[PDB]
């Protein structure tokens, strides 16, 4: 369930789940999927910031 | 018409043609030479 929700949230900001996870690993962020899904539902500005971090790591 | 699995030319006036996915032999000299693969 957590994975499905994270995919849905990431595609609304412009990236796919696999790429998002790869970027977080390359940036050394260690937040797990339960917390990621909770933030996806309850706080969207913070989730957008996380997506930007991953994109910068991949760039 | 000759319906068989091995079809081939039988004289110098025979011709081979492909129609709608089938292989056929037509001849302008002998009606007995008309063949269809099947």
């Amino acid at each position: 369930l957590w994975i499905a929700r994270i995919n849905a949230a990431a595609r609304q900001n412009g990236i796919s789940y696999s790429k998002f996870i790869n970027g977080l690993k390359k940036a050394s962020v260690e937040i797990d999927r339960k917390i990621l899904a909770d933030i996806a539902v309850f706080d969207k500005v913070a989730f957008t910031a996380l997506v930007e971090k991953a994109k910068a790591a991949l760039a | 018409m000759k319906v068989r699995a091995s079809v081939k030319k039988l004289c110098r006036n025979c011709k081979i043609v492909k129609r709608d996915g089938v292989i056929r032999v037509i001849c302008s000299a002998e009606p007995k030479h008309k063949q269809r693969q099947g």
Binding site: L1, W2, A4, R5, A8, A9, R11, Q12, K34, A37, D38, A40, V41, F42 | -
Partner: protein, 142 residues
């Protein structure tokens, strides 16, 4: 903490309108099923319906590849001994154009009460007009 779950009494839904002229049948059906189930929202929950309403226009101008227009066969059985029956894609388009999209989308949804409920939000027409202007749908590009 406990993980969030949606509630059928407070979900929100929206109305979209789509045009099928020249689109590939299966690659349109996948998107329709996705958005009817609600896999594109962050609130998705397997046991609740969190989908949207979709109108489809021009169902008689949908496209297929290869030799399928004359070679794809639909089958069904009537329940009586010996009652097996068939039609081709061309025939189906000639007499019941909407069924072509309806059957394809129905095959891609979950099986059961909730899936039968999800199917009720799809409205397919054969021409270029509908009578749902009171709901104010928005244009969706697929």
């Amino acid at each position: 903490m406990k993980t969030f779950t949606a509630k059928p009494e407070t979900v929100k839904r929206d109305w979209y309108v789509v045009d099928a002229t020249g689109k590939t049948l299966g690659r349109l059906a996948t998107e329709l099923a996705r958005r009817l189930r609600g896999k594109h929202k962050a609130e998705y929950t397997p046991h609740v319906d969190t989908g949207d309403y979709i109108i489809v226009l021009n169902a008689d101008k949908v496209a297929v590849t290869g030799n399928k227009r004359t070679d794809k066969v639909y089958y069904h059985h009537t329940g009586h001994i010996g009652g097996i029956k068939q039609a081709t894609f061309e025939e189906m388009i000639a007499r019941r154009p909407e069924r072509v999209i309806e059957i394809a989308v129905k095959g891609m949804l979950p099986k059961g009460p909730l899936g039968r409920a999800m199917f009720r939000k799809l409205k397919v027409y054969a021409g270029n007009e509908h009578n749902h202007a009171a709901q104010q749908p928005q244009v969706l590009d697929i």
